[PDB]
Amino acid sequence: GEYQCLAALNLYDSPECTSLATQAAVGRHLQVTSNQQGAAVEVCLCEDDYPGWLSLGDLGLLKPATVLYQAKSFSESEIKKLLPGAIAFTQKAMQQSNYYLWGGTVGPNYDCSGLMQAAFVSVGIWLPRDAYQQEAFTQAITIDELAPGDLVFFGTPVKATHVGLYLGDGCYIHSSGKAQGRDGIGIDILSEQGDVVSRSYYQQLRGAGRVVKSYKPQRH
DSSP states (O other), rough: OOOOOOEEEEESSTTOOOOOEEETTTTEEEEEEEEEEEEEEEEETTTTTTEEEGGGGGGGGEOOOSSSSOOOOOHHHHHHHHHHHHHHHHHHHHHOOOOOOOTOSSSSSSHHHHHHHHHHHHOOOOOEEEEEEOHHSSEEOOOOGGGGTTTTEEESSOOOEEEEEETTTTTTEEEOOTSSSSEEEEESSSSTTTHHHHHHHHTEEEEEEEOSSOOOOOOO
């Protein structure tokens, strides 16, 4: 059935609950499946269709839904007006102590795609959870077409593995990891003239996307 989260919940990428997949903010809706494995149960968050594993203890942090989640729609022009608020969310998040948390979604500690999802949700707009899904979902544009509030994608030939929010003037805001990044939220530029972090990510640049609708996944 469908439930509302009474507290922020961790969802894991396996029944073993050793690696975080996403986090569900208080008030989100999820569906609990009959697939229980080990000490966990498979769930699927409603707003982004994102699957993961919930500890069986956390079932007491759910309240049954009698009104099912339905996604809101926005026109392209409505979305344009909301982009400044998404940007502002990221700027404020950068100012709170934070590190790069794989699966971090509720804050203050984000992963790259989790920051994007949280920023857009703050203005009412849903994105899918993972970077490759955010690229599939958004309207592909060229690098040269980037405008503030568009998403910047980085990764392998197979898929995007990283994402940031374009600010203008080649600059973007993102959460990035330890090995090549800042271990948290910061500013980089799409230029080989940038600093070593900027250069590292620039080498992996894949594409760019514009948010032209709010995500409305399929009801399973």
